[PDB]
Amino acid sequence: AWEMGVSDPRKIVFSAKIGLALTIVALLIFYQEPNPDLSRYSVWAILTVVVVFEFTIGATLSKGFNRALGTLSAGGLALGMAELSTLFGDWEEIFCTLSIFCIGFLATFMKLYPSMKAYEYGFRVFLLTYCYILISGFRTGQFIEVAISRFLLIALGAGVSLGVNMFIYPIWAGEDLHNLVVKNFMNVATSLEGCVNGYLRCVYKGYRSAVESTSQEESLMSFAIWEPPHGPYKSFNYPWKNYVKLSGALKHCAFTVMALHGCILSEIQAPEERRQVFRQELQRVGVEGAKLLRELGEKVKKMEKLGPVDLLFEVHLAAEELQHKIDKKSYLLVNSECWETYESASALSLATFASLLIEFVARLQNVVDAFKELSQKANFKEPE
Amino acid sequence: AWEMGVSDPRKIVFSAKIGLALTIVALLIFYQEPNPDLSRYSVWAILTVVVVFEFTIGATLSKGFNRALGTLSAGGLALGMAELSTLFGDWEEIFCTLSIFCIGFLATFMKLYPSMKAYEYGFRVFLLTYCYILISGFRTGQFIEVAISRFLLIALGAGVSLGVNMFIYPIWAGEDLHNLVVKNFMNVATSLEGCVNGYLRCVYKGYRSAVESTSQEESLMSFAIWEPPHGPYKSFNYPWKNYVKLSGALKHCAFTVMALHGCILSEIQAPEERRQVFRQELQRVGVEGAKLLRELGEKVKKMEKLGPVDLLFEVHLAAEELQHKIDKKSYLLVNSECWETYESASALSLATFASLLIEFVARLQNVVDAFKELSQKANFKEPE
Ligand SMILES: CCCCCCCCCCCCCCCCCC(=O)OC[C@H](COP(=O)(O)O)OC(=O)CCCCCCCCCCCCCCCCC
Ligand SMILES: CCCCCCCCCCCCCCCC(=O)O
Ligand SMILES: CCCCCCCCCCCCCCCC(=O)O
C-alpha cells in the first residue's frame, strides 16, 4: 500500500526490477525471427525469471547453484535409465514404471530429514526433472539433443535475471546483518528503561526481537558468504561470525530483562509504599545501562574502536550504591518477630527485582569482551 | 537414515503412497491409445502429483483451493486482456508488454505484505499462468479451446492425488494437535524436576518446546478446520480453539520455569551450606507440581472429566510449609549488623529462587480453569 511503500521504499524498487526483467525478456521473445527450434519452446525463458529472482544477491547465487545441481543430476540419471531400459526389449514400459516408483520413494524419503529441511526446493526440481525427461522421450526416442535446447533458454533467463538484479540497486545480505545487529542494541536499551519505569510507576518488542532473531541472523550469514567484496567490507573473507557472537552475548544479557518484565505481570506484588524507598537507586542503574548499550550500538554502527577510558565504571558504582542501600534498609524485606502468607510472599517479592537488576549489571562484561574481539578481527578505524 | 524409519514409521508410508500415485499415473500414460490432443501433452498430469501432495489432508484441501483460485483468476484475466488488446490493432505488442509489466509489478508488490507470509505460493501460480497464457497464445490466435484440454489433465492428477491420500492410511491434523498438546505437559513436568534437582545438586527442551512452538499449534489449527468428521471428533464444529487456549495457559506457566533454569547459570551463586537448610520443602513442591501436571496431561490424553476431589490441595500445603520455613530462617538471607557486596548478593539469591518457585505454584489455577472449560465445550466423558 502507500504506507507500506513509503515506510520501506525498497519494495517499490524490487517490484519494478522484476517488471523490468519481464519486459526485457518479452521484447526479445516477441521480436525474435522465426526458427525451427526456438519459435515454439521459447516460453521456457520468461518463466525462469519468475523462479530464480530472489531478494538479495547471495540468495540468488546459492539457490541458483542448488537448482542447477539438481537439474543436471536428474538429467544425467534419466538419460542413463532410458539408455539402459532398451536392453530387455519387451518390458520397457514396466522398467520405466518401476524406475518412477524407486526414484520417487527415495526423493521423498530423503527430503523429510531434520537436517536437509531448508533444501526442499532442490529436491523437488530433481523429482520433476527425472519424470519429465523419462516421459517426454518415449515416442520420439531422441530427447538427447532436445534437452539441450530447453537448457539454453533457461540459461538466457537466468543470465538476464542476474544482470538486472546485480547492476541496478543491489541489496546485500551483509548490510542486512550489520543493520540488524545495530538495531538490537537500541531495542534492548529501550526495553530496560521501560521495565524500570513501569515497575516504579505509581517493553515487549525489544527483547522479543532480540531473542527471536537467531535464525534470521544465521540465514543472513549463510547468504553473505557468497557475495563478492564491495564498499567498506573490503576483504576476501570478512569475519561474519563475530557479528553472530556479539548478538549471542547480547541475547544472554536480554534474558534477564525478560525476567524483569515478567516480574510486573506476577500475581504477587509488594505494596507501593515500600517500593518508593529505593526509587533513586533503581533509576540510576537503568539510566547508566541504557547509556552504555547505546554507546556500544553507536560504535558498532560507525565501525570505530573503543576509547582508552573505562566504560563500566559508572554502572559498577551505581550497582554498589544500590547494594549499600539494600543493606541499610534490609529489615523491610523480612520480619524478625518470628525469627528462630500472602503478605510475607509480597514482602519477599520486592528483593527479586533488585537481585535481577544486579545480575543484569553483572552480565555486561561479556558484551564488551565480544565487542573487543569483533573490533580486532575486523580492522576497525582508530578513534578520532 | 535407516533409524529414521523405525523412529517414525509413517514417513515410509508417506513415501510409498507418493510412489504409488506416480506409478498409477505412469501406467495410464504409457498405455493410453493415440489421440489428437493427449498424445503429446499427457505430461501435465504426472507433474501435478508432485505439486499437490501434502503431509496432511487439510493442507491438501487448503492449498489446492488456493492454487485453483490463482489459476482460474489468472486465466480469466489473460483471456479478457487478449481480447481487449486485439481492439487496438497496431501497437498490440506495445500493449502486451505494458500489461506484462503492470501485472508483474502488482503481483510482486502484493506478496510482500507481512500479513501474507504463508500465501507466497498462491501468488506465484498467478504470474506464471498469466505469462503462459499471453505468450503461448499469440502465434495462433486461439488459446481458449486448448486451455480447457490442458486443465482436464490437471484435474485428473489432483483427483488421483486426493483419492490415494485420503483412502489409504490418512493422516489428520487434529490428531497432531491433540498429541502435541498432550506432550507439552510431559515436557514441562520433566523440566521442573530437572531444575530443582540441578539446583540442589551437591531441562532445556522441556520449556523450550512449549514456548517455541506457538506457531505450530496455529498452523495445525488452520489445517484442522477443513477436515471432515472422523473417529472420536464426531462434531461438525469441533472447538479446536480450546486446545490453543490450554496451550497458552501452559506457556504462561512455563515462563517461570525458564527463569528458574536461568538462576542456575548466573554469575552470583549462594553458598551450599545455606542451600542445604531449605531442601525438603523445595523437593516436596518439586514433586507435587510435577504430579499434578502429569495427571492433567493424562486426563487430556484419554478425554476424561475432572473428578470430585481438589487437585491443588497438596501443592498449596507444600507452598505454605515452604513459606513458614523461610519465615523461620530468614536471618540467613539478610544481615542485621548494619541495620539503620558479592556476599550480600550471593545470600540474596536464595530468596529469588524461593520466590520464583512460589509464583510457579501460584499460577496453576489458570491452567486448571482452562482444562475445565475445554472439558465442558467438548463432551468429555465422566470419570470411571
Ligand atoms: C479460464 C481458463 C483458465 C484455465 C487454466 C489453464 C492452466 C494454465 C497452465 C499454466 C501452467 C504454467 C505454470 C508454470 C509451470 C509450473 C511451475 C511450477 O509450479 O514448478 C515449481 C517448482 C518449484 O520451484 P522452486 O521451489 O521455486 O525452485 O519447480 C519449478 O520451478 C519448475 C520446474 C519444472 C520442471 C522442468 C524440468 C525440465 C527438464 C530439465 C531441463 C533439461 C536439462 C537436462 C540437461 C541434460 C543433462 C545431461
Ligand atoms: C514450462 C516451462 C518450465 C520452465 C521451468 C524453469 C525452471 C528452471 C529451474 C532450473 C534453474 C537453473 C538455474 C540456472 C542454471 C544455469 O544458469 O546454468
Ligand atoms: C503444469 C504443472 C502443473 C501445475 C499445477 C498447479 C495448479 C494446481 C491446481 C490444482 C487444482 C486441482 C483441482 C482438482 C479438482 C477436484 O478433484 O476436486
Chain A with chain B: Cβ pairs closer than 8 A: 215
Is the domain of B145 the same as that of B231? no
Domain coverage including residue A152 = 2-167
Distance of CA B35 from the midpoint of ligand 1 (Å): 24
Contacts of A367 (CB under 8 A, 6+ apart): A246, A249, A250, A253, A296
CA distance B234 to chain A (A): 31
**Does the CA dihedral A238-A240-A242-A246 come out positive or negative?**
positive
Evaluate: CB of A289 within 6 angstroms of ligand 1. Answer: no
* C-alpha span between B277 and A75 (Å, rounded): 72
Contacts of B368 (CB under 8 A, 6+ apart): B296, B311, B312
Instruction: Specify the residue with its C-alpha closest to ligand 2, atom 8.
Output: A48
Residue B383 forms part of a structural domain = no
Tally of residues, chain A: 384
Contact (Cβ atoms closer than 8 angstroms) between residue B354 and residue A348: yes
* C-alpha span between A220 and A178 (Å, rounded): 10
Partner-chain contact A93 B30, CB within 8 Å:
yes
CA distance B378 to chain A (A): 30
Q: What is the CATH number of the domain that holds A188?
A: 1.20.58
Burial class for A277, CB neighbours closer than 10 Å (0-12, 13-18, 19+):
middle
Q: Which residue type, as a one-letter code, is found at position A195?
A: C
Contact (Cβ atoms closer than 8 angstroms) between residue B345 and residue A323: yes
Contact (Cβ atoms closer than 8 angstroms) between residue B253 and residue B367: yes
The cell for B342 is 558479592
Contacts of A159 (CB under 8 A, 6+ apart): none
The secondary structure of chain A in percent helix, strand, coil, rounded to multiples of 5, reads 70, 0, 25
Taking Cα atoms as reference points, which of A247, A259, A251, A254 lies closest to residue A289? A254
Tally of residues, chain B: 384
Is the domain of A143 the same as that of A247? no
The cell for B321 is 510449609
Q: Given in angstroms, what resolution was this structure solved at?
A: 2.8
* C-alpha span between B50 and B78 (Å, rounded): 26
CA angle, B131 then B136 then B142, to 5° = 120
* C-alpha span between B240 and B226 (Å, rounded): 12
Residue B384 forms part of a structural domain = no
In three-state form (DSSP H/G/I as H, E/B as E, the rest C), the secondary structure along A103-163 is: HHHHHHHHCCCCCCCCCHHHHHHHHHHHHHHHHHCCCCCCCCCCCCHHHHHHHHHHHHHHH
Is the domain of B125 the same as that of B228? no
> Which domain-ending residue is among A150, A167, A184?
A167
B7, B97, B331, B361: best to mutate for the A interface, most A CBs within 10 A: B97
Q: How far is CA A272 from CA A283, A287, A336, B78, B159, in A?
A: 16, 22, 21, 68, 67
Evaluate: CB of B44 within 6 angstroms of ligand 1. Answer: no
Is the domain of A243 the same as that of A369? yes
Taking Cα atoms as reference points, which of A334, A19, A136 lies closest to residue B30? A136
Residue B360 forms part of a structural domain = yes
Contact (Cβ atoms closer than 8 angstroms) between residue A227 and residue A173: yes
Task: Give the distance, in angstroms, between the CA of residue A60 and the centroid of all CA atoms in the same chain.
Answer: 16
Residue A236 forms part of a structural domain = yes
Contact (Cβ atoms closer than 8 angstroms) between residue A304 and residue A192: no
Can you tell me which residue has the cell 527442551?
Answer: B205
Is the domain of A157 the same as that of A200? no
Is the domain of A249 the same as that of A288? yes
Instruction: Specify the residue with its C-alpha closest to ligand 2, atom 1.
Output: A44
Is the domain of A149 the same as that of A207? no
**In sequence order, what are the beta bridge partners of B304?**
B381
Buried b (16+ CB within 10 A) or exposed e, A241-276: ebbebbbebbbbbbbbbbbbbbbeebebebeeeebe
Q: What is the CATH number of the domain that holds B358?
A: 1.20.58.220
Is the domain of A23 the same as that of A135? yes
Can you tell me which residue has the cell 527430503?
Answer: A111
Q: What stretches of B212-363 show up as alpha helix (H) in DSSP?
A: 214-224, 241-262, 272-277, 280-302, 313-328, 342-362
> Which domain-ending residue is among A113, A144, A167?
A167
* C-alpha span between B212 and B172 (Å, rounded): 22
* C-alpha span between A333 and B332 (Å, rounded): 13
Buried b (16+ CB within 10 A) or exposed e, B199-212: beeebeebbebbbe
Residue A59 forms part of a structural domain = yes
Residue A4 C-beta-side C-alpha neighbours within 13 Å: 12
* C-alpha span between B189 and B209 (Å, rounded): 12
Residue A382 forms part of a structural domain = no
CA distance A328 to chain B (A): 5
The cell for B91 is 501497437
Q: How far is CA A155 from CA A34, A42, A158, B198, in A?
A: 20, 12, 5, 59
Burial class for B151, CB neighbours closer than 10 Å (0-12, 13-18, 19+):
middle
CA distance B267 to chain A (A): 7
Burial class for A136, CB neighbours closer than 10 Å (0-12, 13-18, 19+):
middle
Evaluate: CB of B183 within 6 angstroms of ligand 1. Answer: no
Contact (Cβ atoms closer than 8 angstroms) between residue A177 and residue A217: yes
Residues of chain A contacting B125 with CB distance shorter than 8 Å? none
Taking Cα atoms as reference points, which of A73, A70, A44 lies closest to residue A158? A44
* C-alpha span between A248 and A217 (Å, rounded): 10
Instruction: Specify the residue with its C-alpha closest to ligand 1, atom 15.
Output: B128
Residue A384 forms part of a structural domain = no
Mapped onto helix, strand or coil, the DSSP state of residue B230 is: strand
Contact (Cβ atoms closer than 8 angstroms) between residue A127 and residue B18: no
> Which domain-ending residue is among B139, B167, B195?
B167
* Closest ligand by atom to B129 CA: 1
Burial class for A379, CB neighbours closer than 10 Å (0-12, 13-18, 19+):
exposed
Distance of CA B171 from the midpoint of ligand 3 (Å): 21
Residue A154 main-chain phi, psi, to 5 deg: -60, -40
Domain total in chain A: 2
Q: Which residue type, as a one-letter code, is found at position B184?
A: N
Residue B254 C-beta-side C-alpha neighbours within 13 Å: 27
Is the domain of A256 the same as that of A330? yes
* C-alpha span between B244 and B210 (Å, rounded): 12
Give the number of other CB atoms < 10 A from CB of residue B375. Answer: 19
Largest CA distance in chain B: 102
**In sequence order, what are the beta bridge partners of B233?**
B230
Give the number of other CB atoms < 10 A from CB of residue B305. Answer: 14
Measured torsion, CA atoms of residues B148, B150, B154, B156, in degrees rounded to the nearest 10: 70
Burial class for B184, CB neighbours closer than 10 Å (0-12, 13-18, 19+):
buried
* C-alpha span between A186 and A301 (Å, rounded): 11
Is the domain of B188 the same as that of B147? no
Contact (Cβ atoms closer than 8 angstroms) between residue B341 and residue A317: no
Contact (Cβ atoms closer than 8 angstroms) between residue A126 and residue A132: no
Residue B154 forms part of a structural domain = yes
Is the domain of B68 the same as that of B115? yes
Instruction: Specify the residue with its C-alpha closest to ligand 1, atom 20.
Output: B51
Instruction: Specify the residue with its C-alpha closest to ligand 2, atom 10.
Output: A67
* C-alpha span between B204 and A219 (Å, rounded): 24
Task: Give the distance, in angstroms, between the CA of residue A377 and the centroid of all CA atoms in the same chain.
Answer: 22
Partner-chain contact B97 A326, CB within 8 Å:
no
Partner-chain contact B268 A362, CB within 8 Å:
yes
Mapped onto helix, strand or coil, the DSSP state of residue A270 is: coil
Is the domain of A11 the same as that of A123? yes
Distance of CA B318 from the midpoint of ligand 3 (Å): 61
Partner-chain contact A124 B50, CB within 8 Å:
yes
Largest CA distance in chain A: 102
Taking Cα atoms as reference points, which of A282, A289, A287 lies closest to residue A312? A289
Q: Which residue in A has a C-alpha nearest to residue B339's C-alpha?
A: A328
The cell for A196 is 524500570
**In sequence order, what are the beta bridge partners of A246?**
none
Mapped onto helix, strand or coil, the DSSP state of residue B208 is: helix
